[PDB]
Amino acid sequence: LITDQSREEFDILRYSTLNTNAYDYFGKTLYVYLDPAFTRKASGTGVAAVGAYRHQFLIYGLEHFFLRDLSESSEVAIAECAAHMIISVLSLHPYLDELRIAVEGNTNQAAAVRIACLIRQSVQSSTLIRVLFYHTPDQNHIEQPFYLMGRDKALAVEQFISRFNSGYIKASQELVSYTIKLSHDPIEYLLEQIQNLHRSDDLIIAVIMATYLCDDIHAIRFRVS
Numbered sequence: 001l002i003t004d005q006s007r008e009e010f011d012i013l014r015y016s017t018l019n020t021n022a023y024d025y026f027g028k029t030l031y032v033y034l035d036p037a038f039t040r041k042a043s044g045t046g047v048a049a050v051g052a053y054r055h056q057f058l059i060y061g062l063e064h065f066f067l068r069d070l071s072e073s074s075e076v077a078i079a080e081c082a083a084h085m086i087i088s089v090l091s092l093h094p095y096l097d098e099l100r101i102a103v104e105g106n107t108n109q110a111a112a113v114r115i116a117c118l119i120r121q122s123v124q125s126s127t128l129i130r131v132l133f134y135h136t137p138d139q140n141h142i143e144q145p146f147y148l149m150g151r152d153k154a155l156a157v158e159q160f161i162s163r164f165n166s167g168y169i170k171a172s173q174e175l176v177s178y179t180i181k182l183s184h185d186p187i188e189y190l191l192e193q194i195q196n197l198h199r200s201d202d203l204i205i206a207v208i209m210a211t212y213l214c215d216d217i218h219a220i221r222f223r224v225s
Ligand SMILES: CN(Cc1ccc(F)cc1)C(=O)CC(=O)C(=O)O
Pocket: 035, 038, 043, 044, 106, 107, 149, 150, 151, 153, 201, 202
């Protein structure tokens, strides 16, 4: 259960990240979590781009979208959508010099590795940046660029609820979203998913997980793909 004050302050108090006199105030690494679409009913693809300000977090980008055809063409669509958001966030924040991405590979491990590669090729065509992916060892023990969700989801949700209520999770006032803002405010949209958090959710799961993978404890899992 999320406090009404935290919801109110999340809406009215946002980080002004474009003052050139304040570029050296923020963390220089962008953490991205991607939750791909999974179908009786179909879920969408959730993407969140978070960063650090001291011991707090700020959301830079959010993407939530549903596909019309889910046969390999969707992999290109998911990757391009995520890459477009990342490129725009990096264009506005020149202080970001590292990119740490986690692609959820629970639904399909092979498709997750394909998406990771597609994002890496798009981002590297557009900008010169260090790109690291979360690596998990597969059935054959070879490290692959995907994240596997399990029991730790309970820990990540718990951690989030405590940080959110303390006001340690804030939005950027130059928050990038190409998929949302379609008769919405991206924050008001995210807040609706926050109010339904229990003990569609793809966007809040991406926010919870991106802020969870910020920890030093996970740093060793991020490698060049
Ligand atoms: C079923 N899984 C994979 C999963 C498996 C085990 C686990 F602990 C956590 C996640 C989904 O990711 C579903 C989803 O996004 C959705 O319905 O929007």
